[PDB]
Amino acid sequence: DSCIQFTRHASDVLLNLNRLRSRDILTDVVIVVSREQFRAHKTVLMACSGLFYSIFTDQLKCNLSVINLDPEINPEGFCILLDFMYTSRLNLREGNIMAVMATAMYLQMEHVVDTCRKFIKAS
Amino acid sequence: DSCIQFTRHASDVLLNLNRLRSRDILTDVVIVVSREQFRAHKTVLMACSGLFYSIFTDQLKCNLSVINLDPEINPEGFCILLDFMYTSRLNLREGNIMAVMATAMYLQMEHVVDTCRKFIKAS
């Protein structure tokens, strides 16, 4: 085509979606991880995770307001990944890298799994 | 913070949101422009437009499944802007620039209004 493109558009969209999340605006699901609850937008979860994409394209699960993750999933690992989904920023540290990689493998977030593998190989 | 960042994340998120729109997955509103109907995600509309942000933060309008735009709005101008919201690409042409600028002013899409003003000033 003969389109023009606005370089910062995608980043600005994601910043506004995170502002809606922080104010709890139009969130349509709660993700339960052990005792912890995380509110989010189904569309953002699907756009970032192969697991959520599979869950919310399912004709029965698409209508659920509550999703319980496997009890092996660490709430801190999930929180770091949910923050990444809405910001592109990953808080990867020596003390959380194993929990983050295991959660990213479960959520099917291929690019996060790749950087965790590389950082572990370096150490 | 000490975060790392994935450069292509925001663009990849927007690409997946457009894939959901094209397959009509989790769309929660229909925008009526004259006789034409456009299905979309409320969160994406709010993230891109000052007008939709105002509409869907309103305690009564947030629950509407149908929104009718002002009869002066051109369906082609709206279609081009909805495509921009989901892709960052604007199909700006000599034959549509006046309808696109008027629709962007109504939708309160400041960056689109700015490029339309600049392209009109050049001609």
Binding site: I4, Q5, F6, T7 | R89, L90, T115
Partner: peptide
């Protein structure tokens, strides 16, 4: 704005 750029030419993509």
């Amino acid at each position: 704005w750029v030419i993509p």
